[PDB]
């Protein structure tokens, strides 16, 4: 019966998140902070992809070793950490590979 105008974007260097937030001012932005060497990150990534098809939000992937300043800025200390950003400000986070909690968080702030 419908498809969502979805967006799933992987960032490349510090500055890209701030640019993305400015480019998408009135969307909820959901950021997956992950690491290349993180098993739980790889396991959840296809579920995060599936979620991006269900909600009119901007879904973002950030490798903590490629965007070190951004990880530091968001106080990332475990991976995956999912951050919901609304109107440029952090409104929630989920620490760990729980797709149910991520979806609950999106439901709350979208
Ligand atoms: Ca799908
Ligand atoms: Zn876009």
From TrEMBL:
GO terms for molecular function: metal ion binding; protein-disulfide reductase activity. Pfam families: Thioredoxin. SUPFAM superfamilies: Thioredoxin-like. Residues 5-110 form the Thioredoxin domain. Zn(2+) 2 binds at residue 110. Ca(2+) binds at residues 50, 53. PROSITE patterns: THIOREDOXIN_1, THIOREDOXIN_2. Gene3D superfamilies: Glutaredoxin. Disulfide bonds join 38-41. Keywords: Calcium, Disulfide bond, Metal-binding, Zinc. Zn(2+) 1 binds at residue 24. It comes from the Eukaryota. The keyword DNA repair does not apply. CDD domains: TRX_family. The keyword Zinc applies. PANTHER family: THIOREDOXIN-LIKE PROTEIN 1 (PTHR46115). NCBIfam families: thioredoxin (TIGR01068). This is Thioredoxin. It comes from Schistosoma mansoni (Blood fluke). The lineage of its organism: Eukaryota, Metazoa, Spiralia, Lophotrochozoa, Platyhelminthes.
């Amino acid at each position: 019966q419908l498809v969502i105008m979805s967006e799933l974007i992987e960032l490349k260097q510090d500055g890209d998140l701030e640019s993305l937030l400015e480019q998408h001012k009135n969307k909820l932005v959901v950021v997956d902070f992950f690491a290349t060497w993180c098993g739980p990150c790889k396991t959840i990534a296809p579920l995060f992809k599936e979620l991006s098809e269900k909600y009119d939000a901007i879904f973002v992937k950030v490798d903590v070793d490629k965007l070190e300043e951004t990880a530091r800025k968001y106080n990332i200390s475990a991976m995956p950490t999912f951050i919901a950003i609304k109107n440029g400000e952090k409104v929630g986070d989920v620490v760990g590979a729980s797709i149910a909690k991520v979806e609950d968080m999106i439901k709350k702030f979208i």
